[PDB]
Ligand binder design. Sequence first.
Ligand SMILES: [Ca+2]
Ligand SMILES: [Ca+2]
Ligand SMILES: [Ca+2]
Ligand SMILES: [Zn+2]
Ligand SMILES: [Zn+2]
Length: 166
Amino acid sequence: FRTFPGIPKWRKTHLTYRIVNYTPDLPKDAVDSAVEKALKVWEEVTPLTFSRLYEGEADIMISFAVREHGDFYPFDGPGNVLAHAYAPGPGINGDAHFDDDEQWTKDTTGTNLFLVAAHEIGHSLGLFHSANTEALMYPLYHDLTRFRLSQDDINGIQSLYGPPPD
Ligand SMILES: [Ca+2]
Ligand SMILES: [Ca+2]
Ligand SMILES: [Ca+2]
Ligand SMILES: [Zn+2]
Ligand SMILES: [Zn+2]
């Protein structure tokens, strides 16, 4: 695992998230489910907890976007960069953006929303890219049935937030 410079870490254990918009690619319930599942991946192995907001600024603002979208890092069309997320902190920090020029799917027929979300949330929590090819934080993620957080990812996230309480 790799942890970001000067260890930007959330100073608190409870984080809020907000799904700002929805992709035409999928039913809204599929987007919500994929996000909830992605958050659970990290919650299960740390003391972190999450709750959802429908207004105001949540810690983790989640949105779909294309090309120029209000930050200095425009998306690049179909393929290549699939999404991006900012390290812990206020405002844009912690936020996650998903490139709608990808075809988001609940399975592996396009770009799997759950898997990419899980990876990006890793960034939102302070993890950087792993060298372990089997890690969720390896740049190169993609049998969803056989998905399992790697010990490397668990080691990395616990180095920041510790193991579950009890
Ligand atoms: Ca792209
Ligand atoms: Ca934020
Ligand atoms: Ca799309
Ligand atoms: Zn962006
Ligand atoms: Zn990444």
